[PDB]
Symmetry: D2
Subunit: 116 residues, 4 copies
């Protein structure tokens, strides 16, 4: 899988488990079309969202439902979610790991991109 998402909880110092993640791709008509979704595992990771064949060149958006994650832990966070928007595979296929480091009032997101 060319697209992987990893979510970590900066309060507990652990993977953020069962976090919903939705991926969209900008369509020719400039609207966000559903592309893939899933939930993070016990390791805070989400694999198998797509394939090299399906993951074509385009602008993508990964929305991580951080609000539900914090609310489930008894915390009312600042952000509705964490959304990562980026152009992918414009110079050929690449492997993308989208990491998100979560705190109730702050989050960091990083992309580690490597060749297939």
């Amino acid at each position: 899988c060319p697209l992987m998402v990893k979510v970590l909880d900066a309060v507990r110092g652990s993977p953020a488990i069962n976090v919903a993640v939705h991926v969209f791709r900008k369509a020719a008509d400039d609207t966000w079309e559903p592309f893939a979704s899933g939930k993070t595992s016990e390791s805070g990771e989400l694999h198998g969202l797509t394939t090299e064949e399906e993951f074509v060149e385009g602008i993508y958006k990964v929305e991580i439902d951080t609000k539900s994650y914090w609310k489930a832990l008894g915390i009312s966070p600042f952000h509705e979610h964490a959304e990562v928007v980026f152009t992918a595979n414009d110079s050929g296929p690449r492997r993308y790991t989208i990491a998100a480091l979560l705190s109730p009032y702050s989050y960091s997101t990083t992309a580690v991109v490597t060749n297939p």
Copy 2:
């Protein structure tokens, strides 16, 4: 002004100057409607985006044009922009400072909410 944005450049170690910032408010149609905008100053700050009278409760999105910023510096960026989506609530501190720390392939955004 109850809403301010501050942006920093983690590569140069300085305020991120002249970064375009657009604020949107979610409408009944669930669409994003332009609310306020501007460019960060020499101190990397943007104030005077709104007033207490106009800044009512609701869902807001702050989009920071990080791609144009890195492009101007000749550094290849990953993200199209940095979006901060949140719900403004009156039963909470009155002033919101959205700080964004930028790196070409990584960014963090934090909300510092305080009283006047």
Copy 3:
């Protein structure tokens, strides 16, 4: 004052108030000698640590007592403290702002160096 520290709390989304900060300067014996110290204000800032006359080139260490801060809030922390070690250089901007963004199991520190 050419050196200032600002600390934020990523859990509460506010300035980190009353955090102990100690500055050390590396001596010829390669040991750390106390240089300046204080506690962050209600705005999470610490200024007036030194003067331009005293702040000569050399290696400095800023230690932020993050453990005592989280302990006071009843949240189990990971780090003993946050250390920022750097070389001050005259052939570079004159003012240093060391910002630290705190989470119980994660922290980021950034240097914003500017001219007067």
Copy 4:
């Protein structure tokens, strides 16, 4: 191995390869004694620093040589290194992953702690 270090480059969006890492443990006499060292792999990871038997309860310091990393890339960074100081195994053996996200003038470090 109960102690792993992962280093990422936030400018290139890739693992930070060949980064020197030194680990120390506070001795009964309150000085930092050498404990283990190594360099990050092509994946930005450093495994095999210690064992469950050797990694006893104590205060540890992981110093990541970020300066040499940036200098080798033609960049003069702010920090001399990134040092993570923490108490380990005080409630029994744990597995620690110390992650460091690097930028020339900023760095973030997070600890993901899990049971053996």
